[PDB]
Design a protein around this nucleic acid. Structure first.
Lengths: 206, 134, 190, 167, 104, 244
RNA sequence: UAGCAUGCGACGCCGCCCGCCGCCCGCCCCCAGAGGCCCGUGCCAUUGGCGCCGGUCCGGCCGAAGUGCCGCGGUCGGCCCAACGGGCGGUGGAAUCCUUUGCAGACGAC
RNA sequence: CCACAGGGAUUACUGGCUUGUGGCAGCCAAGCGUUCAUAGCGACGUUGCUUUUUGAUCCUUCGAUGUCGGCUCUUCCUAUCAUUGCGAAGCAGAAUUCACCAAGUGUUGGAUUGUUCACCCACCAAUAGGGAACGUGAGCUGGGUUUAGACCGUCGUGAGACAGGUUAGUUUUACCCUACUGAUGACAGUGUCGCGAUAGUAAUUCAACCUAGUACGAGAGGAACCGUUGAUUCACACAAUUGGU
RNA sequence: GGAUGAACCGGAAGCCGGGUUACGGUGCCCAACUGCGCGCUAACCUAGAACCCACAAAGGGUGUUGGUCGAUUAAGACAGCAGGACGGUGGUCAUGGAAGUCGAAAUCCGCUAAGGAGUGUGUAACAACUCACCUGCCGAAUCAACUAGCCCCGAAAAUGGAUGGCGCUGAAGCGCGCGACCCACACCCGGCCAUCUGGGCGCCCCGAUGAGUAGGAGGGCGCGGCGGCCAUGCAA
RNA sequence: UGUUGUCGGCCGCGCCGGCGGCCAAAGCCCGGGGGCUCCGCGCCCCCGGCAGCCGUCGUCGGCACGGCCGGGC
């Protein structure tokens, strides 16, 4: 039904927290093809369904493949969750054509938050995870749980995740304490609110 | 979710689609753990395999087994639950519906005017903030 | 798939209090405290009046779910017993020619075994949780490992025994080590 | 009911035939189907299966359906059944919880398909047998529903029912 | 499940292109003007701003350029507001590809 | 097989490859010993220039084998290691894109040393009074700018590094007069104390004697002698091919 | 070990620049188990009496860069050209080569 | 002694298909191992996998795919010879025997023969097998095979012939593209110091001493772990010394 | 359409235009469903009609679901834990030796409420403990057996990983039903080119079929010089 | 020469409504009997009057739009 994340003429920020990596990538590839400029944030907190060993073997067949065969130059394998997401986008888009390459170059994937995009990130129409590993439904694996077993960028990324989360928790806690104060004096001035002839036909359309 | 599935009465449920074109329902007869008969007072009964029809919070006061007269009586006793229904939990659609009805002249002047006042309220609200602030 | 399920409720004994927050449960009694996380399918874990009843319940069930609920009940019974009554594993040193000298380093909480099979390099592994080891030497036989938490006590017990394994010739031939003699245990006055 | 599942078609008929004192004698074999298109075909499988006739040495008099029979309402149908998997057709006696004759086919087609593996070519069953609720023998879903009718247990699993949102 | 809230989303729906203006000397970009036959509801234009119109570039059906280019634009703004709307296309269109039925 | 047959280890390492020109003439460390000791009196490295080789006799130590206790020769490289100017304290941040320098606090005196730093380094050989290096602010306006930078640095916990250079006119055998710039990390105890000690170490020179003890185990880093271009036998250690 | 062509940072910064603005010429085209001007002429558009937002002086918080936001006291303003640019104009503050050599080297490079 | 027109319409030959043959495996387990199917050994029969021997076919080339063997040089597989960690034993030690995981590194030097293969000798921790156009001739080599000369044996009346042996018997090209090794090298507000997405890999193994003439053992013999020393092999580098120039 | 693809599927094509479809497909790459009702799988099985090309067998599997049949159950089961067993007589054969417990008769009863000449552990052999049956504690289903699906196993190869790729898992696998959609030059429709039906005044019109190598049959374009007719040329 | 409104033809689209087919019937209210379950609830089945409205075949009835092409009164 209406896809409630999707089009905006310009936006584009996507929350990856416990979203499904290939499902999020599929919408992101479509927004990128449409000419959007897409920033996926919290790539460390994104999820892939399936049992850890079987996810670990897929990537690992790339990791033995990272070694050989040798000029140098690529075939290449990214250790870290934004770059794993970028590797996913560079298969989702037709990846041999200027329209596709120009769409790829409009994506960025950032780990934690970049330095501040404090306009909220938004969830994709049910991309998100809880159920899609179903209760049970066996394991899932986080990209920041994959990339600890593959390497840095990850490691710095999860240490910067930690600090950016701790400080924005503190800054959230107090902004909420003032917002509640503003809400309470706002609601009392709607409880009061002066009168009507025209004006209360609108709250009979909530 | 596998969810609520069952086998009991009193529990109103709300639609995740079908024909009809409605619809809200309550489960009258309960008839294993998939199949169930859902009906409504002024709505048509159907027996569905209905995983993917989900049941709302507000519950109506009846006991187990309902034919038609009994169901009607229960509805009469309750009502109120439909209001919660017009509003809220599932339920929502009468407040929303109040929304859809509105791209229309008389309806458009009622709106500028809600707006115009809304502004006066922002201005009073803002004055208040300024006295509170410092 | 499906099938279906129900609630199971356990009386808490008077010498035990319980407190639950999120899916972490804390169980506390006069042998100490035990804190464990019960995450599982469709399944909630709660205290219906503290000092009355621990409840585990779920709205969904199948052969796998019922196995997990059965493991969960054994874990909680085990916790309740550990906080009032404790756990003990009792374990005996055996050396058939070379004196093995085992003791506890209380700082860096660990049990260290010297002259294992003539090995110059001391073998040690930690102790997990506030488990306590007593070595009641006599000849240098009996080691008693006591705690509230079974999981962590057992890993500590399994680890001492594990510390001695040699796999290199002959399962028959080399009996030098410390072996589990118990399972473990009652509670008690004296 | 809405977009079928298998209304049973009551075909009375004949067998219309020859200048010899013979003639064929009377049958139904009452067959579950979607309207005439299944019938025509259904008869050639019945005629190949029981009597051997021809196609032409079956003639069909009239067809009557059944119109909501069951009124929505219930039974947990005993079905005597044939599934084709890793060879030919194997018998099965399935008694399962359902709504109705519309539902019984699908629950069989889905259970013969998953449970029994069956793929297309297959033809249907032999019979479907109402039974009483206390009687229903074997096993899991139906036993619980039998218990639900008892009651106590219409009013058990409300005990998830009313326990999703909360009280 | 899907937790129907939802919104609605339906494919329908046909419309026609009125005519596409490709102009320069060098200040303007490009315009396309679009007519859906009746459709989007005054609410469903309004709630939205943001129609994607995807039209298949299908053989239509002499021998056509049957290519794996399906083109999908976006509707910028009503100019016509209870009917006709302005639209833009981002690749630029097929030949004189004015006319052909527009769909979502 | 297929072949053959009579099979060999492969000549000349692959961890020592690409066998290719180094990008700059002066070696560069990608990682350091860990902070496990005293504060930034512990500069993590020092420099010198290789003079040649000499040789030593020492009274030894070991005991297990046959020859023991007692005199031995062991072979020696001599390096001239004159005292080196730690000019400035460089503030590195941990970021999820790697380290990033933030701002740098400078002593009052590098002043032929920055003109030498502008000699390949930057370019054009230092004759009548040029290249230019910027002058210090008004003193304590610029020291408050610097001490406001110290404030940010010593609150947000910078991984402290030093810009240092070799004051080369203290060597003689390179008759050359030019400074060689380097990045040396500073390692030690707690991070505030580590910034403080690095500050008190840029406002005056550092000799070898303050970073290394005699006998200490030191990793030495350089750029090999150049040959030019070569074939495989003298470049990877492969065989000559034999027939007459 | 290699590695700013991941399309990066920092430090140090300079025969006329560039810091701040008048006037004109091209490209894309909100936040959010619901919400977001008092008296007037005048078809319009222009154009006049007269709480809530937008550049600003001065400073802080994520920011550790790029990058942003939000406030104590006032001022230019309301109820086209952001991200780029391209100028007519006012006011105001280096390196290659060379020559001789090499720690370097086929040339170039260093 | 050859020559010509053609053919991959048709051979040798590399490749491809097949996989009887070959190699390897699973199943079943008669049976043997004092007694004991399964420590080990294991028939008949039976199902497979590989594609590296042989056979088959005739799809590909006859306006041309250079031959065997060798060498050197890069890379790989695993059905693992050693090394690591393992399980069993008819594992008392202890030499071992079979098997599991496992491809990181090792896997040699010589005597006969063109040989591949294989036989032999001392070594060794063990001196594994299998692919990359039987890897490798715009690298080499040129001993065999396989021209023209000639001998012998056999056959043939003879010219001459043989999967019969022997002596002698040639190795072209200045790299256009591409590939990599290595050096240069614009855009961008500058040089320099840096970061580090990512790309290559570095250590392998042995002997001996401590332990201990201990454990284990009737005895004979004869271990382990660390702790120590040194050296085989590989890598990088320097040149005080010793050695070459 | 099938990733590519002489001969598989759809389909037989004049050119163009529009419409609807076939085969096949609808998560992205890629138009169009992250479609509905239900059920199975968690192995990344797995995205596969057919193909030298897509392998997987004999045989095995308390993985899991499902169907069925027999027997056993509150005249209390299955399992576990706990508890009862005197005497004939150290059972007859055989044999160093069985004597409960190498091998082989034989398996009854008094005395009894239950109480087998005994289930596995023994010492050269002699030496004890448990157990059949019966009972308690517990409380609800248990056991046997046929049949079937999917999965699992058997399952080792050579420069580098894929079902075309990203790659999914209460599905973007699989099966049983179902709804709506997409998609050719097909089929329709509009307008037009040959031949043929023919028709009508050197010309016009109605409708049908109408790819193409070898190739037959027929109409036409261009070259160069000749003749009769007919021009062009100081700018051919 | 280009464009836009339209009248006529062709095809597409969604929605609404009636009647007959299954002698019509789910149905509900009224009235009577039987069974199961025999622990009672509840479940079932059959028959007459009767609001009622159902899923599907066939058929007819009513509207509104678009695309393409052209210009009988």
């Amino acid at each position: 039904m209406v896809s409630g994340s999707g089009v905006c003429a310009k936006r584009v920020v996507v929350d990856a927290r416990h979203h499904m990596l290939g499902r999020l990538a599929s919408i992101v590839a479509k927004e990128l093809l449409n000419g959007q400029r897409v920033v996926v944030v919290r790539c460390e907190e994104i999820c892939m369904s399936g049992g850890l060993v079987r996810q670990k073997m897929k990537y690992l067949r790339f990791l033995r493949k990272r070694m050989n065969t040798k000029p140098s130059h690529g075939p290449i394998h990214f250790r870290a969750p934004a770059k794993i997401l970028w590797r996913t986008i560079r298969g989702m888009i037709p990846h041999k054509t200027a329209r596709g390459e120009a769409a790829l170059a409009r994506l960025k994937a950032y780990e934690g938050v970049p330095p501040p995009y404090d306009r909220t990130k938004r969830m994709v129409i049910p991309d998100a995870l809880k159920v899609l590993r179903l209760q049970p439904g066996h394991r899932y694996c986080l990209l920041g749980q994959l990339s600890k077993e593959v390497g840095w960028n990850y490691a710095d990324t999860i240490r910067e995740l930690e600090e950016k989360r701790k400080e924005k928790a503190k800054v959230s806690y107090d902004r909420r304490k003032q917002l509640a104060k503003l809400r309470v004096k706002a609601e009392k001035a709607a409880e009061e609110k002066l009168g009507t002839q025209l004006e209360i036909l609108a709250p009979i359309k909530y | 979710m596998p969810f609520k599935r069952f086998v009991e009465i009193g529990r109103v449920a709300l639609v995740n689609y079908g024909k009809d074109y409605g619809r809200l329902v309550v489960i009258v007869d309960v008839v294993d753990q998939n199949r169930a008969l859902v009906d409504a007072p002024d709505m048509v009964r159907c027996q569905i395999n209905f995983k993917r029809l989900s049941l709302t919070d507000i519950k109506i006061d009846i006991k187990r087994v309902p034919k038609k007269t009994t169901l009607i009586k229960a509805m009469e006793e309750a009502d109120v639950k439909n209001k919660w229904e017009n509003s809220s939990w599932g339920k929502k659609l009468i407040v929303q519906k109040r929304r859809a009805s509105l791209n229309d002249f008389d309806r458009f002047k009622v709106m500028l005017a809600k707006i115009k006042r809304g502004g006066a309220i922002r201005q009073e609200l803002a004055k208040l903030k300024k006295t509170a602030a410092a | 798939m499906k099938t279906i399920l129900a609630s199971e409720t356990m009386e808490i004994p008077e010498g035990v209090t319980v407190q639950v927050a999120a899916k972490v449960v804390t169980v506390e009694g006069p042998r100490g405290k035990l804190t464990r996380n019960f995450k599982h399918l469709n399944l909630d874990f709660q205290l219906l009046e503290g000092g009355r009843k621990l409840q585990v319940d779920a709205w969904f069930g199948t052969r796998r779910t019922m196995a997990a609920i059965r493991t969960a009940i054994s874990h909680v019974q085990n916790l309740i017993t550990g906080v009032t009554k404790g756990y003990r594993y009792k374990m005996r040193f055996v050396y058939a020619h070379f004196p093995i000298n085992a003791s506890i380093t209380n700082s860096n909480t660990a049990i260290e075994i010297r002259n294992f099979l003539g090995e110059k390099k001391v073998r040690k592994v930690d102790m997990l949780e506030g488990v306590t080891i007593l070595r009641s030497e006599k000849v240098k036989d009996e080691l008693v490992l006591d705690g509230n938490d079974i999981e962590l006590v057992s890993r500590s017990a399994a680890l001492i025994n594990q510390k001695c394994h040699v796999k290199n010739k002959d399962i028959r031939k080399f009996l030098d080590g410390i072996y589990v003699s118990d399972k473990g245990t009652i509670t008690e006055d004296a | 009911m809405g977009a079928f599942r298998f209304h049973q078609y009551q075909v009375v008929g004949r067998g219309l035939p020859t200048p010899t004192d013979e003639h064929p004698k009377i049958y139904r074999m009452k067959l579950w189907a979607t309207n005439e298109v299944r019938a025509k075909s259904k008869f050639w499988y019945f005629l190949r299966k029981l009597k051997k006739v021809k196609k032409s040495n079956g003639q069909i008099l009239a067809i009557n359906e059944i119109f909501e029979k069951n009124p929505t309402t219930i039974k947990n149908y005993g079905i005597w059944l044939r599934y084709q998997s890793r060879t030919g057709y194997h018998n099965m006696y399935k008694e399962y919880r359902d709504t109705t004759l519309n539902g019984a086919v699908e629950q069989m087609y889905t259970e013969m398909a998953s449970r029994h593996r069956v793929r297309f070519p297959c033809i249907q069953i032999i019979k479907t047998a109402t039974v009483h609720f206390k009687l229903c023998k074997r096993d899991n879903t139906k036993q619980f529903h039998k218990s639900d009718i008892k009651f106590p247990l219409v009013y058990r699993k409300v005990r998830p029912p009313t326990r999703k949102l909360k009280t | 499940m899907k937790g129907r809230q939802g919104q609605r989303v339906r494919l329908y729906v046909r419309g026609t292109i009125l005519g596409y203006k490709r102009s320069k000397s060098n200040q303007y970009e490009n315009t396309s003007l679009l007519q859906i036959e009746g459709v989007n509801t005054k609410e469903e234009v309004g709630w939205y701003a943001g129609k994607r119109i995807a039209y298949v570039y299908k053989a239509k059906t002499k021998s056509n350029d049957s290519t794996i280019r399906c083109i999908w634009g976006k509707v910028t703004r009503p100019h016509g507001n209870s009917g006709v709307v302005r639209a833009k296309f981002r690749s630029n269109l097929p030949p004189t590809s004015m006319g052909k039925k527009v769909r979502v | 097989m297929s072949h053959r047959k009579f099979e060999h280890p492969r000549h000349g390492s692959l961890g020592f490859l690409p066998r290719k020109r180094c990008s700059r003439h002066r070696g560069k460390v990608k990682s350091f010993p860990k902070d496990d000791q005293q504060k930034p009196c512990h500069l993590t490295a020092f420099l010198g220039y290789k003079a040649g080789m000499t040789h030593i006799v020492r009274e030894v130590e070991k005991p297990g084998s046959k020859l023991h206790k007692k005199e031995t020769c062991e072979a020696v490289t001599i390096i001239e290691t004159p005292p080196l100017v730690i000019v400035g304290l460089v503030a590195y941040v941990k970021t999820p894109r790697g380290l990033r320098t933030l701002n740098s606090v400078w002593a009052q005196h590098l002043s032929e040393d920055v003109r030498r730093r502008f000699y390949k380094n930057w370019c054009k050989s230092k004759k009548k009074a040029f290249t230019k290096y910027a002058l210090k602010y008004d003193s304590d306006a610029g020291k408050k700018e610097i001490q406001l930078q110290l404030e940010k640095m010593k609150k947000y916990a910078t991984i402290v590094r030093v810009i240092a250079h070799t004051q080369i006119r203290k060597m003689k055998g390179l008759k050359q007069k030019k400074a060689h710039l380097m990045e040396i990390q500073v390692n030690g105890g707690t991070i505030a104390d580590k910034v403080d000690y690095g500050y008190k170490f840029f406002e005056k020179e550092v000799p070898v004697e303050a970073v290394f003890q005699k006998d200490e185990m030191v990793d030495i880093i350089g750029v090999t002698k150049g040959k030019g271009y070569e074939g495989v036998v003298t470049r990877w250690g492969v065989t000559r091919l034999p027939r007459k």
